[PDB]
Design a protein around this nucleic acid. Structure first.
Ligand code: CA
Ligand code: MG
Ligand code: MG
Ligand code: MG
Ligand code: MG
Ligand code: MG
Ligand code: MG
Ligand code: MG
Ligand code: MG
Ligand code: MG
Ligand code: MG
Ligand code: MG
Ligand code: MG
Ligand code: MG
Ligand code: MG
Lengths: 97, 127, 245, 100, 116, 82
RNA sequence: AGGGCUACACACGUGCUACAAUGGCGCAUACAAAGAGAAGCGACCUCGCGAGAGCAAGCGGACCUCAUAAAGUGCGUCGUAGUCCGGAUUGGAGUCUGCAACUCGACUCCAUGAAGUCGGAAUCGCUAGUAAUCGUGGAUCAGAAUGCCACGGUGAAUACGU
């Protein structure tokens, strides 16, 4: 089983990882290493004056962070627990068999 | 017992392995004279060897990914000068005096708002 | 059981699909899409009609869903996974045997594996198909898959089925398919047919027949067809592909 | 934006996604080379009949706060102005000033 | 080196030379010198009367020179006599295909007419 | 121009009211805002006064006017010179 | 609903493409970065000279798709011509988006082949991976960049001095 973790904060994500790679160890299973992935950086430019003045801008950004964790030898026990976990708000997870 | 460097210039990265031998070179499963058309490139790649006359006393092996020609060519030179002063912690001082040991750093400047390029700014004629 | 519609049931027509297995297998080669173990076999037969298989059966686009800004093209392409509604879990064609098991009685699930060759094992075309169109509506799996087979055999038996059996390996024409088909059902319900050909020269790969919604359970007849103005890309002639390459 | 102008966008959305299928299939025959000249010719007359405001190309993305027709951003559904205003409060998760 | 009742350069590669014919561009030039299986790099001066004729033949397949010039002129007369928007653009001597005139448009209008 | 496969475009309203012109022979001019519509052969012989923005202007249709679009005969700007 | 903001004796500003041989054309062949995609990015196959069309894998993506970088390089040709330079203008024939491209779209093929031979007085940018020059992406967006915002390739000149 693979779970991909994704979020806007980096401290926040490096929690959920540690949380999951604690349970996986708990409910007897081998977890194949939290491996980080390229972080997408959507960028935006906007006129900051409400009229005229083209050369006056802000440059905004959203950094998305991706993490991947595997499940080597999925115990029957684990599959329920790693499914049943209330996980920090503002974090998307995608467990997929 | 093969000696290794990484080497970077602009956007290039060059991982290199040297071994004692008669003076062969491979870049990305290819020969020097093939991979690099431009003459400059060649000069640059071998000038660390040409310095410490091991031009034909060691046999080199390389791969490069990223950058253009003068980038890769440059990145390789740095790669060698790293390995070549690791096989021999001795040579450093000589290598260094030629200014091969430093990693260039010069990158392309970003484009900025209000400008046509990094620093070129649109005309306005007082004419 | 009878095939009836629970949640959602407001559509004009089922649309039965049929893969000319030889012609289907052929494309796979031409395009170089991987050798699936279904075609890897492709052993010959005595009757040259058992190549006419069921690829699927597909309910119409139910008015309710259509009223939320959904059109046939999307409907077909996603089915129950369509948004905003119905929006059920996604039936991947790339990871087939990951979709839920259907619950199929081996009475049907043998009958099916005679007319849907790559069903079960490491193929699960059954599973995927149920997700894509069955699930949403709330059908009886043993009935639904059942109702397919019923209709498949009916067509092999008809004048239509015979024509392919006859002109196997040979080039043909729509006209002589048109006759063939009509002689069973009528010169009223020809347009309900739509063909699909591939390659050069054209060889038939797929056949689709657009059956009225009320008449799905009760056997076929001159009043069990809904003609639609799309005849398909096949053109004036086409090969009835023989097995091989 | 004038209340009226905000409104038209609702009239226009509603129709667009009610006749959505009718248009699609009624278009589908038009572009079918291999179809009845009788059919397709009918269609051309039939599409032009059902109402203009029911076309998706007829609508205009307006900030869903102030109604502005210009300087829209899809990611937020807001004008450049309201995007900035909200950005600075921290009402847009993640978003923040950038340098490189 | 007389084709379509005009003199063709005889020191030019056939490809280039044949273009002097009004109504043949470069695509046609290539075709001609293959439909009439004549090489491209061959200069016109080093040919046979025979070669020049089979060539003369190919060119007759098209509508060219005089003929063409007439066709065009009919088409434009046709428009102006119809009086369509496109017609008047041709009369008043203005960009016929939607181009701006507030500025530029000097190829139709010709060089500048000052004020006063 | 419009793809060839999609056929020639005419607004229906106007298409209809040049059956009654051609069947039930009249001899009046017709009002129309249908500058889109291309001129069909049926339209040969009938004056039809197409809108230019403020006024309708008569276009006595002919053989030569076939395929073109009405509005291609109702100029919409006034210019004498400077 | 239709038209107008796209009007054109003219004046000014900001750009693009040129005027050629450090170049045009044909064949052959190297080396990037950054970014976008959900009912969206759309391969492979078939059709078409081409814009494209049909069919339909994969991908909510370090995996699939956009999407083959170009200048460069080798071999050939043109031989200093208003030219094999330039590509404006216009006729003919198409494609696609869209209820709909007459006024007023982008693109394609065939033909056409203008001004321009390096620009008076004035006047602007830039001190290093900068200027110069070459390609790539994105936002807006049904369709409609030579603009804007980003990304790499090649890569100078000269500062005595006040
Ligand atoms: Ca075969
Ligand atoms: Mg991405
Ligand atoms: Mg500016
Ligand atoms: Mg640059
Ligand atoms: Mg108000
Ligand atoms: Mg719009
Ligand atoms: Mg041309
Ligand atoms: Mg209006
Ligand atoms: Mg304006
Ligand atoms: Mg320039
Ligand atoms: Mg040229
Ligand atoms: Mg885009
Ligand atoms: Mg082709
Ligand atoms: Mg400075
Ligand atoms: Mg550029």
């Amino acid at each position: 089983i693979r779970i991909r973790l994704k979020a806007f904060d980096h401290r926040l994500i490096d929690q959920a990882t540690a949380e999951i790679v604690e349970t996986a160890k708990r409910t007897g299973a081998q977890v194949r290493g939290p491996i980080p992935l390229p972080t997408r950086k959507e960028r935006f430019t906007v006129l900051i004056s409400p009229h005229v003045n083209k050369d006056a801008r802000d440059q905004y950004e959203i950094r998305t962070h991706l993490r991947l964790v595997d499940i080597v030898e999925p115990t029957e026990k684990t599959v329920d627990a790693l499914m049943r976990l209330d996980l920090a708000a503002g974090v998307d997870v995608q467990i997929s068999l | 017992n093969q000696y290794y460097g990484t080497g970077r210039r602009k956007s290039s990265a060059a991982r290199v392995f040297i071994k004692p031998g008669n003076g062969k070179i491979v870049i990305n499963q290819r020969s020097l004279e093939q991979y690099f058309g431009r003459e400059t490139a060649r000069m640059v790649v071998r000038q660390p060897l040409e310095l410490v006359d091991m031009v034909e006393k060691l046999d080199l092996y390389i791969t490069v990914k990223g950058g253009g020609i003068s980038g890769q060519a440059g990145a390789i030179r740095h790669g060698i000068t790293r390995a070549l002063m690791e096989y021999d912690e001795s040579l450093r001082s000589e290598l260094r005096k030629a200014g091969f040991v430093t990693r260039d750093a010069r990158q392309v400047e970003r484009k900025k708002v209000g400008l046509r390029k990094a620093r070129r700014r649109p005309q306005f004629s007082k004419r | 059981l009878a095939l009836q519609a629970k949640q959602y049931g407001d559509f004009d027509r089922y649309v039965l699909a049929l893969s000319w297995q030889t012609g289907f297998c052929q494309s796979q080669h031409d395009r170089n899409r991987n050798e699936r173990d279904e075609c890897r076999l492709q052993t010959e037969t005595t009757n040259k009609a058992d190549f006419l298989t069921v690829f699927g059966l597909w309910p119409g686009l139910p008015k309710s869903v259509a009223a939320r800004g959904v059109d046939e093209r999307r409907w077909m392409r996603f089915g129950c996974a369509t948004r905003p509604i119905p929006n059920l879990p996604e039936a991947r064609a790339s990871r087939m045997c990951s979709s839920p098991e259907t619950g199929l009685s081996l009475e049907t699930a043998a009958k099916l594996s005679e007319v849907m060759p790559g069903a079960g094992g490491r193929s699960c075309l059954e599973r995927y198909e149920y997700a894509k169109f069955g699930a949403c509506f709330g059908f009886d799996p043993d009935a639904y898959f059942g109702t397919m087979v019923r209709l498949n055999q009916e067509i092999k038996e008809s004048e239509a089925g015979k024509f392919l059996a006859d002109n196997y390996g040979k080039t043909v024409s729509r006209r002589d398919f048109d006759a063939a088909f009509a002689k069973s059902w009528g010169k009223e319900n020809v347009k309900a047919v739509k063909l699909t050909c591939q390659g050069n020269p054209a060889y038939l790969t797929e056949i689709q027949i657009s059956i009225k919604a009320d008449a799905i359970n009760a056997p076929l007849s001159a009043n069990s067809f809904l003609p639609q103005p799309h005849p398909g890309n096949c053109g004036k002639t086409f090969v009835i592909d023989k097995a091989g390459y | 934006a004038k209340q009226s102008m905000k409104a038209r966008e609702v009239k226009r959305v509603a129709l667009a996604d009610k006749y959505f299928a009718k248009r699609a299939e009624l278009k589908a025959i038009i572009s079918d080379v291999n179809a009845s000249d009788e059919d397709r010719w009918n269609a051309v007359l039939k599409l032009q009949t059902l109402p203009r405001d029911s076309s998706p190309s007829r609508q205009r993305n307006r900030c869903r706060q102030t109604g502005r027709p210009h300087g829209f951003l899809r990611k937020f559904g807001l004008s450049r102005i309201k995007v900035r205003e909200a950005a600075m409060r921290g009402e847009i998760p993640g978003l923040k000033k950038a340098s490189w | 080196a007389r084709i379509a009742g005009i003199n063709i350069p005889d020191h030019k590669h056939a490809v280039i030379a044949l273009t002097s014919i009004y109504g043949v561009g470069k695509t046609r030039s290539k075709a001609i010198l293959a439909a009439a299986g004549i090489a491209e790099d061959v200069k016109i001066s080093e040919l046979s009367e025979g070669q020049i004729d089979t060539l003369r033949d190919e060119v007759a397949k098209f509508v060219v020179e005089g003929d063409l010039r007439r066709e065009i002129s009919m088409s434009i007369k046709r428009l102006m006599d119809l009086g369509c928007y496109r017609g008047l653009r041709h009369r008043r001597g203005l960009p016929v295909r939607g181009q701006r005139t507030k500025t530029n448009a000097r190829t139709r209008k010709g060089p500048r007419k000052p004020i006063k | 121009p419009r793809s060839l496969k999609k056929g020639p475009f005419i607004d229906l309203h106007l298409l209809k009211k040049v059956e009654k012109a051609v069947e039930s022979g009249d001899k009046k001019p017709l009002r129309t805002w249908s500058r889109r519509s291309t001129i069909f052969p049926n339209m040969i012989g009938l004056t039809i006064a197409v809108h230019n923005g403020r006024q309708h202007v008569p276009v006595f249709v002919t053989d030569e006017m076939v395929g073109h679009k009405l509005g291609e005969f109702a100029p919409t700007r006034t210019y004498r010179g400077h």
